Symmetry: C2
Subunit: 101 residues, 2 copies
C-alpha cells in the first residue's frame, strides 16, 4: 500500500527492489502513476528486467519520452477509441479548448 504522500514512495520501492518483486500491478490515478514512474526512474527500476501493469484508463495521458528507451515492458488498458477520424477530430477540437487552462 502506498503512503498518503505521493512523493514518499522511496521506502516502498526500496523494500520492493529487495525481495525480487518485478511483476507489479499498479492501481491509482494517472497523476499518482506518473509520480510513481518518476520515483521508479529515480532509483533504477526502469530496465528490461521489470514489468508494469496499470489498472487506470489514462495511461496514454502520461509522457513516456524519458522512459521508452529503457526497454521496460509496460502494459495498460484504454477505452478511448482514438483511432477513429471522428473521435480524433473531436479531440483536436478539445485541444483548442483545454489550452486556455
Amino acid at each position: 500500500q502506498l503512503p498518503a504522500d505521493t512523493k514518499d514512495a522511496k521506502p516502498l520501492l526500496k523494500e520492493m527492489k529487495r525481495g525480487k518483486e518485478f511483476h507489479v500491478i499498479f492501481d491509482c490515478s494517472h497523476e499518482m502513476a506518473a509520480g510513481i514512474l518518476k520515483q521508479a526512474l529515480a532509483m533504477g527500476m526502469m530496465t528490461e528486467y521489470y514489468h508494469y501493469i496499470f489498472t487506470t484508463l489514462d495511461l496514454f495521458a502520461l509522457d513516456v519520452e524519458p522512459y521508452r528507451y529503457s526497454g521496460v515492458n509496460m502494459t495498460g488498458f484504454r477505452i478511448l477509441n482514438t483511432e477513429n477520424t471522428q473521435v480524433s477530430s473531436i479531440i483536436e477540437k478539445w485541444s483548442m479548448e483545454r489550452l486556455q487552462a
Copy 2:
C-alpha cells in the same frame, strides 16, 4: 569513441548494453560526462550492476 555531438550517444549506449559491458571508463569533460549520465539514465543503464 563518442560521436561529434553529445546527444548522439544513444546508439553507442545501445551497443554498450548489448554484450553486457558494465565496467566503463569515461574520458571527457564534465559537461560531456553530465550528458552521458543523463542519456544513460534515459537508456536504463543506471542500475546496481554497472560501474
